[PDB]
Design a protein. Structure first.
Lengths: 251, 251, 251
């Protein structure tokens, strides 16, 4: 449940690299990891020498989503997800995701939150929420303004699995790259040429609409996420996945 | 002026297929057909065994649009168009268009309304509204949030004709397929794996913005659609098409 | 600081061609040029025989942006930019950009404002605003509703330079063409087949959202554009470009 911070003295550039390092649960979104990510962004922003952040990961999974009354707990998990995403969106620093592995559930919210997102040949993406009786409610806050409408409907509904070239095609990421590290380094160079003020303002232009969306919908989507989480359809839906069988609405 | 309903016992899956079957006017949007489509969606939703709907058609035309004071009539046609589209958008069921033939005018509103839309090698699309002195007013309710801005402006203005690969490119449909039936069956399988609640909620996430658009603009767009319909430019515009000549603003 | 007007008697079609003809400052947005562009659109609209406008240019640069208390001046430049873009968006006439050369800064606002934009093999595009301590504030009014979200974030932040095929890919222009004149002539033919009323209304459908954006943000973005312009980071940022060195936040 750890996030590694590496600043300009370590990166050798005007860049902070925050690396998700929780391989035991495949980088799941534990509260500890969340708080450490928050602290990472705080430290990054606090350093006048940093002009960009890279959100990297270890292991073959970028982020698999959350880990585990029930409703209160669920609605707070949703809220913390939202708060984190918002933290990324609100930052004066452009944030670049370096992805080379699987992304599921909340992982999507993280990717959507980053201003730039690059993904490599090992990556995979699947919105199987509906398959377990729920919906990608909270992650919609950063998914819906970046995905083409057709794509969002399609993958939300089909729950099918897709690669990096597809994710680029649909707006989920900025670009598919065979060498993620190289691509991200190039991007870091270019962005790094921007002035702190210029970059903050340029980003804020692009995030104003997103933040408007948070303001209007975040609490609503948290409460729905919880209602769904506690429902019986989701119970059966999760049991079926654990028991490795098919859920009772499908055979 | 008929729509065929085929339920799970007939489809052999958790799917209802509503097939537009009005070849005499090439599947035009008569009031009867409209009411029957409404009833089809009502029956589909009413069946707990149905988790998805396919909107299919017979003949080489998916939908050619409407068939035929004048203003009152026009504004009610517009309103009925809107109501139908809204019925599709509001449904708890994901709706998939299976298209393999021509789409014109209101047909566009139907395609735009579906959550997923697949189109085959026989398909064609043209927004010739401006050519006859009118505009695609009411269909904008589902076209504008799904088409890329450049595409919408372009084809709205040029009235040029395009194919399925292009329609996929611009957001008008989800995917171009050589074998529409196969593609749609695959999609039906995948979506069908979703839970009723999960699918309804996942869809509602994607349609909230659309429905907001209906709330704000539907009546406005109906009244404009009627004003345009009754205007003299549209009269001349329609006469010219009937008389098979060029309209008086073009040679 | 001149714009050439050529009407239907000259064009030989239902088209007015406004050609940016200010090669001494590579078609920069001087107030004179701005007023003449305004007058060009006014004359175009005034001519019942005109159904479309082409915004063309001479020289290898389409538009390089603006030319040159300080704050008052900056905020008025921003406001005039906005007013011009709005003039284009509000017009009853579809406006087509014919681009074959460089586009920078405000040039982007012009391209974004046109309903249709075609660009040739000589074209280049770069948002280096952040590089000089500023942001593409005012041009966001027409850029943000037409660019894919990922693209806008990327190029706003990286300031990297891109070509016509890329600009087409991201929504900045409608289409990349090897022969711009031919492409634009074809488009002009097709649009020209539209009725004046039909075209005005069809366009207004597509611009309603844009104009809403102007209403909400234009003044805000002007004031921010000025605050940025007068800041010290932008001073250093501009000096560095003039002195041909690297700015003090980059080496």
């Amino acid at each position: 449940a750890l996030v590694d911070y590496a600043g300009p003295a370590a990166t050798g550039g005007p860049v902070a690299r925050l690396t998700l390092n929780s391989p035991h649960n495949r980088n799941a979104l534990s509260s500890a990891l969340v708080s450490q990510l928050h602290q990472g962004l705080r430290d990054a922003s606090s350093d006048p020498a940093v002009r960009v952040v890279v959100l990297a990961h270890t292991g073959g999974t970028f982020c698999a989503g959350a880990d585990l009354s029930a409703y209160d707990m669920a609605v707070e998990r949703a809220r913390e997800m939202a708060a984190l995403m918002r933290a990324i969106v609100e930052s004066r620093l452009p944030v670049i995701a370096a992805i080379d592995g699987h992304v599921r559930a909340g992982g999507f919210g993280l990717v959507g939150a980053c201003d730039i997102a690059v993904a490599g040949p090992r990556s995979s993406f699947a919105l199987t929420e509906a398959r377990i009786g729920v919906a990608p409610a909270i992650i919609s806050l950063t998914l819906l303004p970046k995905l083409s409408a057709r794509a969002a409907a399609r993958y939300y509904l089909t729950g099918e699995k897709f690669d990096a070239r597809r994710a680029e095609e649909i707006g989920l990421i900025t670009m598919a790259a065979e060498d993620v590290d190289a691509a991200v380094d190039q991007l870091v160079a270019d962005v790094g040429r921007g002035s702190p003020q210029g970059l903050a303002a340029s980003k804020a232009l692009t995030t104003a609409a997103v933040l408007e969306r948070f303001d209007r919908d975040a609490e609503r989507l948290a409460e729905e996420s919880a209602r769904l989480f506690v429902s019986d359809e989701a119970r059966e839906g999760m049991l079926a996945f654990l028991e490795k069988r098919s859920p009772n609405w499908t055979s």
